[PDB]
Amino acid sequence: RPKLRVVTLVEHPFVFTRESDEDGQCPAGQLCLDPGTNDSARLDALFAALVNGSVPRTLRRCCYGYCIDLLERLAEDLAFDFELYIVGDGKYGALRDGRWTGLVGDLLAGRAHMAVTSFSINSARSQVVDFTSPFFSTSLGIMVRTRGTELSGIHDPKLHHPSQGFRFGTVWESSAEAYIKASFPEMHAHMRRHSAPTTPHGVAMLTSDPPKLNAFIMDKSLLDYEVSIDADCKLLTVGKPFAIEGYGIGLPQNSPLTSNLSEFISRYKSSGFIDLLHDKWY
C-alpha cells in the first residue's frame, strides 16, 4: 500500500483534534503532527522521527471529524495508507509576495500528496493545483450578534459605506478574502484591518467585550456550526447567500490519484454517504 502524506487544517466540524494518549498514540481518531513549519526538511525529519527518533506529545494530536471519516473511507476503497500533519501557518492559501501560502503552498512545494479539510475550489487555486470533484458545497455567509445588525447580504450599503465604528472582517488568506479582493476591492480595504487568522478568532471578535466586529464573513457551513454551539445562542447568520464554492481534496497538478478519488467521491454523494457524514457531524 502506498503511504500518502496528507496536510490538513483544523476547522470544525470538518477537522477537530484532541490530545494524544500517554504514549502519543490515538485510540480514537488519527495521529496528526502539529509541526508549525513550512520547512520541507524539518517536516521530513519530523515524520522520520516517528520511526527512529522521539516526537514529543506537544507536537502530536489526534484528528477526527467529517473529513477524517471521508479520508478513512477513501483509504479503504483505494487501498492506501496515510500520515497527517496540520499546515504550519494555519491558512487555506493565498498568493502573497509571489508565493502561495497555506495548503496550496504545501501542495506546490511537494510537502504533501493531498490536502484534506474544508478546502474551497476557486479559479485562482485551480490554475496551480488540482482538485477532485467536490464533496460538499457552501455559500459565503455573514454572522452577527442577535438583536443588532441586520444585513441584506453582500450588497448591503452598510458594508459599502460603513458608518463610524462599524467593523466587519473575514479570515486572512481564505477563499472568502480572495472573492472580496477580486469583486469588492474598496470593501476589502476596510476589512483587511479587521480580519482574523482563523474562523474561531473571527467569531470571538463578535463576542468580545467590547466587540471588535459587527459582522463576520466566512463559509456559511462553518458559520452555521459556530451558531449551533454558541452557549447563549447569541449568534446568527443573515442575508442572501453569495459566492457559492465547492469543497474538494487538493492535490499537486497532474497527480495520478485525482481521478480515482473523484470517482469515489461521486459514488459517496449518490449513495447517501456524504449526507450521512453531514448528519453525523452537524
Curated annotation (Swiss-Prot):
Binding site for glycine: 118, 120, 125, 175, 219
Tissue-by-tissue expression: Expressed in the hippocampus, the corpus callosum, in the facial and trigeminal nuclei of the brainstem and the ventral horn of the spinal cord.
Location within or outside the cell: Cell membrane; Postsynaptic cell membrane
Annotated D-serine binding sites: 120, 125, 175-176, 219
Topological domain spans for side Extracellular: 150-282
Disulfide bonds: 26-62, 32-63
Source organism superkingdom: Eukaryota
Residue positions the entry lists as glycosylated: 38, 52, 260
Description of how the protein assembles with itself and partners: Forms heterotetrameric channels that contain at least two GluN1 subunits and at least a combination of one GluN2 and one GluN3 subunits (in vitro). Forms heterotetrameric channels composed of two GluN1/zeta subunits (GRIN1), and two identical GluN3 subunits (GRIN3A or GRIN3B) (in vitro). Does not form functional homomeric channels.
Job of this protein: Component of a non-conventional N-methyl-D-aspartate (NMDA) receptors (NMDARs) that function as heterotetrameric, ligand-gated cation channels with low calcium permeability and low voltage-dependent block by Mg(2+). Forms glutamatergic receptor complexes with GluN1 and GluN2 subunits which are activated by glycine binding to the GluN1 and GluN3 subunits and L-glutamate binding to GluN2 subunits. Forms excitatory glycinergic receptor complexes with GluN1 alone which are activated by glycine binding to the GluN1 and GluN3 subunits.
Family: Belongs to the glutamate-gated ion channel (TC 1.A.10.1) family. NR3B/GRIN3B subfamily.
Protein name (Swiss-Prot/TrEMBL): Glutamate receptor ionotropic, NMDA 3B
Organism listed in the record: Rattus norvegicus
Shown part of the complete sequence: 414 to 808 of 1002
